[PDB]
């Protein structure tokens, strides 16, 4: 009857389940704690069947979807309680999306065979503008300006959003009711990316004021502010530990932040075409690093504005491996449009051969934690799946999924099924314009919606 | 809120205690009284308050830490 007895009961029931499932028992228990050890332990890329993937694109009403966040309950071995907030939410998978229309919307994705199903939503508007005009008085319940990011707490109790209102609003998962509003207290403290520490209430916020903020959601309080980036911090990623990584965009420095040590590691690409062409004896100078994801505690990957995907190791400041023009080159502008001269050849000279051709940029780049595979996104019209070599010194193209059409603002992955047989569902937010701004020329075929594809493992 | 962080934790069996450096982050506030530090370090390290000693605390110029 005592709580320790309850744990003894749950542990006893847990073992009986493992015995029913079945060496194998010992290996699984080690796999249960493999997360604590900072090394990849999910080698399932070769098992994935991309060709047979059931791809599906779900349209929605929102214009210009900006980000999507997914919540997956996980059984805690350490107390035998699922991360579901309540009994009703046992084994229910939720996805939260934000767009430039000032809506937060949640969907149910538990049924992988079925499409996401809307549950609740909240709109912001001009009603929520602050009258005071003071940063510290910017505590209105709702958004009034573009929402850019959304992150769901690992506990499944709260979801946090931020955007061009310079706010961090945390919402109740069940009802999408506002419980707290935390101003950044800066003129240019523009939230650009949010990352939750895995299985923790710690939140890391990357702000365009050139700073990173750290938060504890369970306390509704600000912890620390991080400096060192020489430009806007567009992306941030976090894992079970506290060493979150960030990228500086035009600063071109992928940055790892050791919170426990208050020390920081600097990573720079430092590639230049001239030698690269010489060693070859279209390669574009790197533009900015606009996405980052941590494959492992000791490794991470980045995406750039020359179409280059770079693999990184904590030991080495320089990239260990790189793929150039991963998503290809943009279509060349039409000759009938480049110039108004009727003579076709005159119009062709304005194309200047292939000098004008530029590469796609890596709008989205997500890696499943502690796995050998990750997914890259752009507006090329296809999601590319890559597999990292066992030595983690190179990666190759596993395949592609052409279902999505439009700019991939964010990518998420959720899995279901037994441990041995797991079927992966990839969810990617699709928009008609880039999340940060409207620079993109309207790409034919783009639709603002959530892309969904189901992948299963065999052999 | 106020954060407190312990670093450089050294175990000392023959005097039977633990040493460490305390970093107290107190935005929008002067500082933390030693008694509050003692009681919560007792809570976290899970010892009785009387067994907890704290001393030599200096705030950084500009405040907050």
């Amino acid at each position: 009857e005592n709580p320790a007895d309850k744990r003894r009961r749950l542990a006893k029931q847990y073992l009986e389940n493992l015995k029913s499932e079945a060496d194998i028992i010992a290996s699984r228990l080690k796999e249960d704690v493999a997360e604590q050890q900072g090394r990849v332990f999910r080698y399932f890329g070769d098992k994935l069947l991309i060709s047979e993937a059931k791809q599906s694109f779900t349209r929605v009403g929102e214009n210009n979807l900006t980000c999507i966040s997914c919540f997956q309950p996980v059984l805690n071995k350490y107390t035998f309680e699922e991360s579901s907030n309540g009994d009703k939410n046992k084994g229910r998978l939720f996805a939260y999306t934000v767009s430039k229309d000032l809506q937060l919307t949640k969907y149910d994705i538990t049924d992988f065979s079925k499409r996401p199903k809307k549950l609740k939503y909240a709109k912001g508007g001009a009603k929520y503008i602050p009258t005071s005009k003071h940063e510290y008085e910017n505590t209105t319940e709702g958004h009034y300006d573009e929402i850019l990011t959304v992150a769901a707490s690992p506990d499944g109790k709260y979801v946090v959003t931020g955007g061009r209102d310079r706010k961090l609003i945390v919402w109740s998962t069940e009802s999408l009711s506002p419980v707290k509003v935390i101003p950044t207290k800066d003129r240019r403290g523009e939230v650009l990316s949010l990352a939750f520490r895995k299985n923790s209430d710690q939140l890391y916020a990357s702000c365009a004021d050139f700073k990173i903020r750290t938060y504890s959601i369970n306390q509704f309080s600000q912890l620390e502010i991080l400096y060192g980036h020489h430009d806007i911090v567009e992306d941030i990623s976090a894992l079970a530990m506290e060493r979150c990584v960030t990228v500086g965009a035009r600063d071109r420095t992928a940055m790892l932040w050791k919170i426990p040590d208050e020390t920081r590691l600097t990573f720079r690409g430092g590639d230049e075409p001239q030698k690269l062409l010489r060693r070859w004896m279209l390669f574009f100078c790197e533009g900015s690093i606009d996405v980052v994801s941590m494959v492992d505690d000791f490794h991470f990957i980045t995406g750039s504005d020359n179409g280059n995907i770079c693999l990184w190791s904590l030991a080495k400041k320089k990239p260990i491996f790189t793929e150039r023009i991963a998503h290809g080159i943009l279509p060349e502008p039409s000759f009938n449009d480049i110039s108004g001269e009727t003579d076709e050849e005159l119009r062709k000279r304005q194309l200047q051969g292939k000098k004008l051709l530029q590469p796609f940029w890596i709008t989205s780049l997500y890696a499943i934690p502690y796995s050998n595979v990750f997914i890259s996104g752009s507006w090329s019209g296809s999601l590319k799946v890559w597999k990292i070599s066992d030595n983690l010194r190179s990666f190759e193209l596993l395949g592609e999924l052409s279902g999505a059409k439009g700019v991939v603002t964010k990518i998420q992955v959720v899995e279901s099924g037994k441990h041995g047989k797991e079927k992966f569902r990839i969810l990617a937010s699709i928009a008609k314009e880039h999340r940060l701004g409207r620079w993109i020329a309207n790409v034919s075929g783009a639709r603002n919606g959530i892309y969904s594809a189901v992948i299963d493992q065999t052999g | 809120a106020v954060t407190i962080r312990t670093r450089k934790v050294i175990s000392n069996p023959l005097l039977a205690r633990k040493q460490f450096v305390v970093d107290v982050l107190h935005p929008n506030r002067a500082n933390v009284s030693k008694d509050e530090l003692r009681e919560k370090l007792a809570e976290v390290y899970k010892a009785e308050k009387d067994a907890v000693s704290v001393f030599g605390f200096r705030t950084q110029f500009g405040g907050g830490k």
Partner: peptide, 8 residues
């Protein structure tokens, strides 16, 4: 390694 905390 040390421990982390927060109040009020």
């Amino acid at each position: 390694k040390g421990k982390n905390l927060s109040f009020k």
